[PDB]
UniProtKB/Swiss-Prot annotation:
Binding site for Zn(2+) 13: 50, 55, 72, 75
Effect of residue 348 to V: In strain: Theta/P.3
Lineage, top ranks: Viruses, Riboviria, Orthornavirae, Pisuviricota, Pisoniviricetes
Localization, UniProt: Host endoplasmic reticulum-Golgi intermediate compartment
LRR repeat boundaries on the chain: 208-228
Binding site for Zn(2+) 12: 16, 19, 33, 39
List of residues binding Zn(2+) 11: 5, 8, 26, 29
Protein name: Helicase nsp13
Impact after mutating residue 240 to Y: In strain: Epsilon/B.1.427/B.1.429
Domain (+)RNA virus helicase C-terminal as annotated: residue spans: 419-572
Known role: Plays a role in viral RNA synthesis. Multi-functional protein with a zinc-binding domain in N-terminus displaying RNA and DNA duplex-unwinding activities with 5' to 3' polarity. Activity of helicase is dependent on magnesium. Binds to host TBK1 and inhibits TBK1 phosphorylation; the interaction with TBK1 decreases IRF3 phosphorylation, which leads to reduced IFN-beta production.
Length: 572
């Protein structure tokens, strides 16, 4: 009931009852809120309400203190003070940006912009508020009751009338009823049970809204610069493999936190694991939002670090198949590999947070909450894809607003930049270097002469809102008969519905751009499918074409992105 003010930390009794988080506001700040917003309910030990029987006045602006009790204009005794006076709300121990965060629906980009340009305590308020709002939106969607079970990977669904139907991608993970988590793909719908169960007809699925805990720790701890490497002990015997990263590794030990911008295939995993070999006695917690990113760091560790000193931390509510080659759930091992949501309460000499473009400010805070560390390293690329903002439908979120780390990387620049792409044919490196990396990304590989582009708008059909371009899949089919080396190629598009069609016609393994991020394939076929802001997003485009080691075919809808591709153009 008595806590600290989210804007000035000033001790107070006052909480906003109208805010969904109910933040402590100090007399001077609580006023500026309630006088400028539809937010009028204030809480103390007891609510600021008229205490007269049957009186429904709760608006703090229309209330008075009569003794130790509160009354409206109609019930106040002659000797009474207005609760709102001289820029204050009467409480014990006697902001434009707070108001916008407190009252926005989170459907506008500008909401996310403000949640990242504001002060540090307002980043936490925003991050809880947003996440709270995201969770209570899941309740808006209708229940899926099973009408008929066709097979072990297909069934038919009956949807709740009067409630919208959630996108049936892999993004939207349902909870079945507790028959385990389930996902769906597009009357024949494809079902995938994290726990395998003889699917019972009549059983139902619901999206698991998880309670949003409060944030305490900042997104980013305060920066500390040191004169010598602090708390870490370097080798003099670091293998030439990692000699390229020694100067950056010393920067890591002479700062509290450091930022690494690593474009695709520039040696991020190599950097992260090489840090353990440079500071060989240091305890390092390796974290990322997704299981795939933490498992990617496990593969690299398996190759270079002693397997006995590694532990993969798996939450007992296991949702996807996870890295198996380490001892599982040994929190005390020198090397700990854990998703942000599973992190234990522990300490560490270095924390490495990977895939930083995918992190929210909520995730940045949780990490700082669960891990007390001498050094924090943030690895990723603001030119790659951010975490999906399910509520955002109006305006595009720029990379400087993805989170606090990406905002630093886009304004004052990253502390360290890996500038040489060792994965991609020069045609792809040249294209993305000019598009998102200000001509600072360099190609280690030669031109493959296997990078082709074709301008072909085709015809755009929709499965609800997910896009399909059959003629673009048709052009790929034609190309494959003539280019049989591409039979091994991964098919990539910005839409699962296009991928679903391309899976039946082509038989290629299928991937969305967003699910492709962090993976590489010798050959990539990309159909842009549509000209929308989704399919023309330069970050998504960057990730799409930088998956390829040897060749790429890009069937394009957007003239701009087609022209920019420094690829050999095809006809038809
Ligand atoms: O100009 C740079 C840069 C660099 F070239 C070296 C170090 C830090 C930097 F921000 N970049 C633009 C986007 C990709 C990196
Ligand atoms: Zn409020
Ligand atoms: Zn205050
Ligand atoms: Zn009253």
């Amino acid at each position: 009931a008595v806590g600290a003010c989210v804007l000035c930390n000033s001790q107070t009794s006052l909480r906003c009852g109208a805010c969904i988080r109910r933040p402590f506001l100090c007399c001077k700040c609580c006023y500026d809120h309630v006088i400028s917003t539809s937010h009028k309910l204030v809480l103390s030990v007891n609510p600021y309400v008229c205490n007269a029987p049957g009186c429904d006045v709760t608006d703090v602006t229309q209330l008075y203190l009569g003794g130790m009790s509160y009354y409206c204009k109609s019930h106040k005794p002659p000797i009474s003070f207005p609760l709102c006076a001289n820029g204050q709300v009467f409480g014990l121990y006697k902001v434009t940006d707070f108001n916008a965060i407190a009252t926005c629906d989170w459907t506008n980009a500008g909401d996310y912009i403000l949640a990242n340009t504001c002060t540090e305590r307002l980043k936490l308020f925003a991050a809880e508020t947003l996440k709270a709002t995201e969770e209570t939106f899941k309740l808006s969607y209708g229940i899926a009751t099973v009408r008929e079970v066709l097979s072990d990977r297909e069934l038919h669904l009956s949807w709740e009338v009067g409630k919208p139907r959630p996108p049936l991608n892999r993004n939207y993970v349902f909870t079945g009823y507790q028959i385990g988590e389930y996902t769906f793909e597009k009357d024949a719908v494809v079902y995938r049970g994290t726990t395998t169960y003889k699917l019972n007809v009549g059983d139902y699925f619901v999206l698991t809204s998880h309670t949003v805990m409060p944030l305490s720790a900042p997104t980013l701890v305060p920066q500390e610069h040191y004169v010598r490497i602090t708390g870490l002990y370097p080798t003099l015997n670091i293998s030439d493999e990692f000699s390229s990263n020694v100067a950056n590794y010393q920067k890591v030990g002479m700062q509290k936190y450091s930022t690494l911008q690593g474009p695709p295939g520039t040696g991020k995993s190599h950097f992260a694991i090489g840090l353990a070999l440079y500071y060989p006695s240091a305890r390092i917690v390796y974290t990322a939002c997704s299981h795939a990113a933490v498992d990617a760091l496990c593969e690299k560790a398996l190759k270079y670090l002693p397997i006995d000193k590694c532990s993969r931390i798996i939450p007992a509510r296991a949702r996807v198949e996870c890295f198996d080659k380490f001892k599982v759930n040994s929190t005390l091992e020198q090397y700990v590999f854990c998703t942000v949501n599973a992190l234990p309460e522990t300490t560490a000499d270095i924390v490495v947070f990977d895939e930083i473009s995918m992190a929210t400010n909520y995730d940045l805070s949780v990490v700082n909450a669960r891990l007390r560390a001498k050094h924090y390293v943030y690895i990723g690329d603001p030119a790659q894809l951010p975490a999906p903002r399910t509520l955002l439908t109006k305006g595009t979120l720029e990379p400087e607003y993805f989170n606090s780390v990406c905002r630093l990387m886009k304004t004052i620049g990253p502390d360290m930049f890996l500038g040489t792409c060792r994965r991609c044919p020069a045609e792809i490196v040249d294209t993305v270097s000019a598009l998102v990396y200000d001509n600072k990304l360099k190609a280690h590989k030669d031109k493959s002469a296997q990078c082709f582009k074709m301008f072909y708008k085709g015809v755009i059909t929709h499965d609800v809102s997910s896009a399909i371009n059959r003629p673009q899949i048709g052009v790929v089919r034609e190309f494959l008969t003539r280019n049989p080396a591409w039979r091994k190629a991964v098919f990539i598009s910005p839409y699962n519905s296009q991928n679903a069609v391309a899976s039946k016609i082509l038989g290629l393994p299928t991937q969305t751009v967003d699910s492709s991020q962090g993976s590489e394939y010798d050959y990539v076929i990309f159909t842009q499918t549509t000209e929308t802001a989704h399919s023309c997003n330069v970050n998504r485009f960057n990730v799409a074409i930088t998956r390829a080691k040897v060749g790429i075919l890009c069937i394009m809808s957007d003239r701009d992105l087609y022209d920019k591709l420094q690829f050999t153009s095809l006809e038809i």
